[PDB]
Amino acid sequence: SLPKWNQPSKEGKKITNLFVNNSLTHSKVEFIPQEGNKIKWYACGPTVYDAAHLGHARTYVSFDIIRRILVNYFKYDVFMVINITDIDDKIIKRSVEEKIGFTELARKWEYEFWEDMKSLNVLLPTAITRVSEYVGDIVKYIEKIIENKYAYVSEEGSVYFDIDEFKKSEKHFYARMEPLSVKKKKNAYDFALWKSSKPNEPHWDSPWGKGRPGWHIECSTMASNILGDVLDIHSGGIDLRFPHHDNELAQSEAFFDHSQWVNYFLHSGHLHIEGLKMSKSLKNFITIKNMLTKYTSNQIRILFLLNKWDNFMNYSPNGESMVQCIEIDKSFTNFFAIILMKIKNFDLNSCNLYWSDADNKLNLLFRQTKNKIHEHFLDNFNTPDALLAIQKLITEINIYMDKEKIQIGLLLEIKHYINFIFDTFGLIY
């Protein structure tokens, strides 16, 4: 009566003892690759009909940070796919209102989305998969689900996922992550894989008649084609966990007729503003472009570094939440300023380099900080505590650079380590 989860075997895998909050187990579990040190990762992308806002930035920056930790810090090999939903009810509606083609609208806002991601120093994925370029593959994917008897065709030419038939199989469970969230249909919970199109909507040919992909089928199709029958990581905001992500699991399990398409499903918490999710529907949003006319990429990234990725966060506007971010950014700027100059202007001809007790004490705190930050990253990507550890180290380095005769090589190594962590955070100084 309750979904089971199979932890990957550790034999032959890279083992870091990283633990992650897995929505499939609703618990922190040890992260174990399916193969070697490889991570196949699919993340749901935006629906490109309007500008992106600070809530979208929170999800994509948080998972950018996680990806940098996985790759730059732990040395996993990440193969990442992000889709672009450039066919959608919202795009169609917006495009008639503005009297422009569906493709021209979608391409503009896809362009602005990637520009906003680049402005926030978010890395592009390995592959970008647009629905409009995968419609043929989606049709073939649906044909296989029908052939496995997990979907049916209505008279109008739609295709619906057959929840009851899927559940019946002992190898399949429907709504693995939110079990409790559950006329032409067998049962009302059945969802469309293929929607019969009105003659005035954009549409594509199919064995069942002119139509469009359903809301969820594109993500199973694209991830399955490129990454295959087992994903190490699948990610998105928490609102997508059900119906969207649970439905992806059902579609993909039905396609491959197996029991676990995704090993680790990661859900970022929502950014709220004045207690409510930042949302285009609520008209309480701040565009990323507007945010960047007031704050820098570094300051915005610090905002997200200070909030655990899988917890919700409150954003207080009019600069309230950003006060701390600006202070931290300023302290990092001034630290780098001093250490860079002290290194550049250091004179080996006239210095004394005896390794003193003050040098030893700073070095001990330095190596200790490396170990604290390691534990924070293993603890479900705990960037708030890792950032605080960096701040504490910087406080002591600043004292050391002011009074003690300075060990040039120790400061260079410290600068390189803090640079390494800031690269992992996505900060640029």
Ligand X SMILES: Nc1ncnc2c1ncn2[C@@H]1O[C@H](COP(=O)(O)OP(=O)(O)O)[C@@H](O)[C@H]1O
Site string for ligand X, 333-372 (x = CB under 6 A): -------------------------------------xx-
Question: Which is it for strands 127-130 and 151-153: parallel, antiparallel or unpaired?
Answer: unpaired
Q: Site for Zn ion (CB under 5 A): which residue of 44, 142, 300, 328?
A: 44
Q: How far apart are CA 174 and CA 1, in angstroms?
A: 11
Q: Is 239 in the site for Na ion (CB under 5 A)?
A: yes
CB-based contacts of 136, cutoff 8 Å, min separation 6: 204
Residues 33-72 within binding reach of a second copy (CB under 8 A): 36, 38
The residue among 162 and 310 lying less far from ligand X, judged by its C-beta, is 310
Q: Among residues 28, 90, 107, 342, which is the contact residue for a second copy, using CB under 8 A?
A: 107
Q: Which does 237 bind (CB under 5 to 8 A by kind): Zn ion, Na ion, ligand X, none?
A: ligand X
Q: How far is CA 377 from the centre of its chain?
A: 16
* Pairwise CA distance, residues 415 & 283, whole Å: 43
Compute the least distance from the CB of residue 5 to a second copy, in Å: 27
Q: Shortest approach of ligand X to residue 148 CB, angstroms?
A: 26
Q: How far is the CB of 416 from a second copy (least distance, A)?
A: 8
Q: Does 257 bind Na ion (CB under 5 A)?
A: no
Annotate 249-312 with three-state secondary structure.
Answer: HHHHHHHHCCCCCEEEEEEECCEEECCEECCCCCCCCCEHHHHHCCCCHHHHHHHHHCCCCCCC
Omega before residue 3 within 30° of 0, cis = no
Q: Identify what 239 binds: a second copy, Zn ion, Na ion, none; CB under 5 to 8 Å per kind.
A: Na ion
Residue 75 binds to a second copy (criterion: CB under 8 A) = yes
User: Given the complex with a second copy, which of 25 and 126 has the nearer CB atom?
Assistant: 126
Determine whether 333 is exposed, middle or buried from the number of CB atoms within 10 Å of its CB (0-12, 13-18, 19+). Answer: exposed
Residue type for position 248: E
Q: Which does 214 bind (CB under 5 to 8 A by kind): Zn ion, a second copy, ligand X, none?
A: none
Sequence-separated (6 or more) residues with CB below 8 Å from residue 256: 224, 229
Query: Which region, judged by CB under 6 A, interacts with ligand X, from 13-21, 171-179, 287-295, 398-406?
Result: 13-21
Contact residue for ligand X among 211, 213, 214, 237 (CB under 6 A): 237
CB 284 within 8 A of CB 327: no
Residues 6+ apart with CB under 8 A from 51: 109, 112, 116, 287, 288, 289
Question: Which residue number, 12 or 275, has a Cβ lying nearer to ligand X?
Answer: 12
Query: Mask 35-64, x = binds ligand X (CB under 6 A)?
Result: -xx------x-xx-------xx-xx-----
Near ligand X by CB under 6 A: residue from 24, 82, 222, 240: 240
In whole angstroms, the minimum distance from the beta carbon of 216 to Zn ion comes to 7
Report d(CA 322, CA 186) in Å as an integer.
51
Nearest to 58 by CA among 218, 325, 271, 370: 271
The neighbour count for residue 352, using CB atoms within 10 Å, is 6
Min separation Cβ 78 and ligand X, Å: 12
Q: What's the CA gap between 208 and 57, in Å, rounded?
A: 39
Binding region for ligand X (CB under 6 A) = 12-17, 36-37, 44, 46-47, 55-56, 58-59, 75, 77, 85, 236-237, 239-240, 268, 270-271, 277-278, 370-371, 374
Binding region for Na ion (CB under 5 A) = 167, 172, 239, 242
